[PDB]
Design a protein around this nucleic acid. Structure first.
Ligand SMILES: O=[N+]([O-])c1ccc2c(ccn2[C@H]2C[C@H](O)[C@@H](COP(=O)(O)OP(=O)(O)OP(=O)(O)O)O2)c1
Ligand SMILES: O=[N+]([O-])c1ccc2c(ccn2[C@H]2C[C@H](O)[C@@H](COP(=O)(O)OP(=O)(O)OP(=O)(O)O)O2)c1
Length: 848
DNA sequence: CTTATGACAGCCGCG
DNA sequence: GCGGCTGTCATAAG
């Protein structure tokens, strides 16, 4: 079969590559690769090579890679463009693999591992690695085996060997419930000391060296730990053998609160599964712990255990190991579902990049564009440095805070790529400039037509509509491929078909990101602004077009139909369209959902396309790619007192949705956005009730809402203390910690954290509050034994019995209810023009 | 990343 | 004792 790369690395004048050969064998080669870069030349010099601007270029072959780099520096000094691909690994891959790469994952060693490190003094810092590794579970995808490394004697105790037999049994039988599917795939290896285990693991590693190395938190915990441990114990010469090319680099990552270290294992591609998940799941999760994610994904989670993990090895080593196995298998189970690694393998081979560069839209697009330009002898521009400079972005209408009985929303598809394509925005496409009228003038087609020669954007930009721009071409090609591969979604292969289609979608949605990123070879401020400013007029123009149409239809005049617009959406108030027929004519809920759907399809969408073809002519664009789809139809169930929907402000609304782009729901479902019910900081029991409140407001009406309040409020004190405790994340605890006490500016949760410490001071048993970790918070009644307004303890857990009974006694229900339930509700009912209790004076609603 | 809201913390000005 | 305000910190959804 066809050859394919595995990992590629540049070291000095060499390029080191692991690859699969003609006969499926994994192997390594060192190549003294000669790069070509390109300079500009006079018309005199005749060449096949031109830059994107059609300017002639000379191909400079270099004897070695350092030459090429030294040349880029020399060229930088003179002040002349050094164009071509500066990242020689990409160039090497483009040269070596000059075809559509077809890979076979059965020949790619994917490893999932986790370690366990008994640490009795807090989280074992990986860069310090000061505690013995007492378990490694390492899964090899080729052998389909779980290789379990068990330390039997540590500083923290001696233990019996782990039992597969006991592991297989049910929890009720004293078992660990390690699944049947993996019980015959475990290879158990106990060790008498830690050096014996680490050197046996290190051999194992050379024998079965990961191409893709993954798992949950490997890049931040497991890899740094193993590395520093081996390193500290055996010296760096030994730890480096953990890379196939024996080169490793320590890298520091700065962030919000501080910096961090990762080990770059040259010749391996590390795809931490936590990072694959956060990147490609597209579901903002309240927690990213393997336990929570595995629960959300598989309805099962990580193995359960009594007491702290720090005592588990001593207390129940049997479980401790089994828990190490289950956690590695959890990741595998999630990947069996979401397919992220396969999706990474697809993208990486499609772009011809190092697989790990799937985390970089920059690196991916750059390599994709470079290749297609290479195929036509074109020379990519030098990556110039650019001052990071904020430009305007998405437009968001101020909603008038109200209730909205019938709402119908619409959506522009793939707005930003669409605009790039519609206008022809690209570096080499810039054709000039035009005198900008205020954006409002363009919105109302009142400004003078920008140009009738060039494709225009309301930010003053003008583009050639005669040339086919590099970027719009590349984004058009990815669109066309999507269709193609989602056309084989008519025909085992309904797998490679999905991942191709999903990955084209990922590239499409990631392009604008890159184009706004200053380290993009094709970044251009004038252009990025052109995209966002065009989008800003697209949306408001169509807000105008929609109002005009519906006013004309309804015989109304100057009636605000479009109630809200967020980035690529418009939400349309369909009250009057309903009134045209009249409510009593509809027989059931489904009958008016029928009516609206029909009206949008037959009357609005034609008026919308009609409206956008006008904009296209006004701006003089290359082609018309502005297409809207009807998203939601929302309202109260027929013959009910329910309000249907409400907006409390920008990105703050609830809708009672009946139909999402064609799909008609059985029961109605609440689309809630921005409101406290969608907030992780909101207590469990309260999240549940605000949602009930919103359910009752939209579907049932005021008297129902009021009934639930009076009831929930009567019944608050009996709810579990953990369910009514608000969550928060603790950051810079020390930064506000002045001798155990809240210094200037100390935020509410951190104050609570210190109050806990004050009651914790001098306790081992007590679970300490980790800096950068989620914390429960609870208000305390005035004059309490902890001497503060609040207390805050670690989340996901019950509070220590050393203070628990005094917390429960002193916690301020009144201040808790008002702060977490009532105030947010008053929020919603105020907007929806509703009362959550009777006899509320009408006069509150005024600024008297 | 940016667009945007909310919980709180001092600060200010007020007989 | 407190509303109007600028600021830090949290979280949301593209
Ligand atoms: O488009 N391609 O398919 C393509 C384009 C360029 C390619 C290759 C394969 C190599 N190169 C480039 C990269 C090198 O700098 C130069 C010569 O490549 P080579 O493999 O012929 O190396 P030589 O130095 O000639 O030695 P070799 O012939 O023994 O490998 O040409 C393939
Ligand atoms: O988005 N921009 O970056 C932007 C947008 C508009 C811009 C400029 C710079 C000028 N304009 C406006 C204001 C000018 O009156 C008009 C004409 O553009 P131009 O480039 O023709 O400017 P001139 O100085 O007239 O150039 P010329 O006399 O060489 O044609 O375009 C830049």
């Amino acid at each position: 079969m066809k050859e394919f790369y595995l990992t590629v690395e540049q070291i000095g004048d060499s390029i080191f590559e692991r690859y699969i050969d003609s006969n499926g064998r994994e192997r390594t080669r060192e190549v003294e690769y000669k790069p070509s870069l390109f300079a500009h030349c006079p018309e005199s010099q005749a060449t096949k090579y031109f830059d994107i601007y059609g300017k002639p270029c000379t191909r400079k072959l270099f004897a070695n890679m350092r030459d090429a780099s030294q040349w880029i520096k020399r060229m930088e000094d003179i002040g002349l463009e050094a164009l071509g691909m500066d990242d020689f690994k990409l160039a090497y891959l483009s040269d070596t693999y000059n075809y559509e790469i077809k890979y076979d994952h059965t020949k790619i060693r994917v490893a999932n591992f986790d370690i366990e490190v008994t640490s009795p003094d807090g989280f074992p810092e990986p860069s310090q690695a000061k505690h013995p590794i007492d378990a490694i579970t390492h899964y090899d995808s080729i052998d389909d085996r779980f290789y379990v490394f068990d330390l039997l004697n540590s500083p923290y105790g001696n233990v019996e060997e782990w039992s597969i037999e006991i592991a297989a049994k049910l929890q009720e039988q004293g078992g660990d419930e390690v699944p049947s599917e993996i019980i015959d795939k475990i290879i158990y290896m106990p060790f008498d000391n830690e050096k014996e285990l680490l050197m046996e693991y290190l051999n194992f590693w050379q024998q079965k060296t990961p191409v893709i190395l993954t798992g949950w938190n490997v890049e931040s915990f497991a890899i740094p730990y193993v590395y520093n441990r081996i390193k500290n114990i055996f010296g760096e010469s030994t730890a480096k053998r953990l890379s196939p090319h024996r080169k490793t680099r320590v890298k520091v990552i700065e962030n919000m609160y501080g910096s961090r270290e990762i080990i770059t294992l040259f010749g391996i591609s590390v795809l931490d599964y936590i990072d694959l998940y956060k990147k490609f799941s597209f579901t903002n999760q309240p927690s990213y712990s393997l336990d929570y994610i595995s629960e959300f994904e598989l309805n099962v989670g990580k193995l359960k255990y009594d007491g702290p993990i720090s005592k588990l090895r001593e207390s129940n080593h049997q479980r401790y190991i089994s828990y190490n196995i289950i956690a590695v298998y959890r990741v595998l189970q999630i990947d069996a579902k979401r397919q992220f690694i396969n999706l990474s393998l697809d993208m990486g081979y499609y772009a011809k990049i190092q697989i790990q560069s799937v985390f970089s839209p920059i690196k991916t697009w750059d390599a994709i564009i470079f290749n297609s330009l290479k195929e036509q002898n074109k020379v990519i521009p030098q990556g110039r440095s650019h001052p990071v400079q904020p430009y305007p972005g998405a437009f968001v209408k101020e909603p008038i805070p109200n209730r909205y009985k019938y709402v119908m929303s619409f959506d522009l598809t793939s707005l930003y790529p669409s605009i790039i394509r519609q206008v022809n925005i690209s570096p080499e496409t810039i054709a000039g400039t035009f005198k900008v009228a205020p954006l409002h003038d363009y919105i109302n087609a009142v400004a003078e037509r920008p140009s009738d020669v060039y494709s225009c954007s309301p930010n003053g930009m003008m583009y050639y509509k005669d040339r086919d721009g590099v970027v719009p071409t590349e984004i058009t090609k990815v669109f066309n491929q999507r269709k193609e591969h989602k056309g084989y979604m008519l025909a085992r292969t309904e797998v490679a078909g999905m991942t191709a289609q999903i990955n084209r979608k990922l590239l499409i949605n990631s392009l604008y990101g890159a184009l706004g990123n200053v380290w993009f070879r094709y970044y251009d401020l004038r252009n990025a602004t052109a995209i966002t400013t065009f989008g800003q007029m697209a949306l408001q123009w169509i807000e105008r077009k929609v109002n005009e149409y519906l006013n004309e239809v309804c015989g109304t005049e100057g009636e605000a139909f479009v109630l809200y617009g967020d980035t690529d959406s418009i939400y349309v108030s369909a009250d009057k369209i309903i009134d045209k027929v009249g409510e009593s004519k509809f027989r059931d809920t489904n009958h008016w959902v029928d009516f609206l759907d029909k009206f949008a399809r037959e009357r609005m969408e034609p008026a919308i396309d009609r409206g956008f073809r006008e904009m296209c002519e006004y701006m003089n664009n290359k082609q018309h790619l502005m297409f809207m789809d009807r998203e939601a139809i929302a309202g109260p169930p027929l013959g009910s007192k329910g309000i249907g929907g409400f907006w409390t402000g920008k990105k703050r609304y609830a809708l009672n949705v009946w139909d999402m782009e064609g799909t008609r729901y059985a029961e109605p479902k609440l689309k809630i956005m921005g409101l406290e019910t969608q907030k992780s900081s909101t207590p469990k029991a309260v999240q549940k009730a605000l949602k009930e409140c919103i359910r009752r407001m939209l579907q049932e009406g005021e008297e129902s809402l009021q009934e639930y309040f009076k009831e929930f409020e009567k019944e608050f004190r009996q709810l579990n203390y953990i369910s009514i405790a608000s969550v928060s994340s603790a950051n810079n605890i020390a930064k506000y910690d002045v001798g155990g006490f809240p210094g200037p500016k100390c935020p509410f949760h951190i104050r609570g954290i210190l109050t806990y410490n004050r009651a914790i001071k001098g306790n081992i048993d007590a679970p300490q509050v980790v800096e950068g970790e989620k914390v429960y918070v609870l208000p305390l009644r005035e004059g309490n034994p902890f001497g503060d307004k609040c207390i805050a303890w670690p989340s996901g857990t019950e509070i220590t019995d050393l203070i628990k009974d005094d917390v429960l006694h002193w916690m301020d229900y009144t201040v808790l209810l008002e702060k977490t339930f009532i105030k947010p509700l008053e929020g919603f009912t105020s907007a929806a023009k509703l009362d959550y209790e009777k006899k509320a004076s009408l006069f509150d609603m005024f600024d008297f």
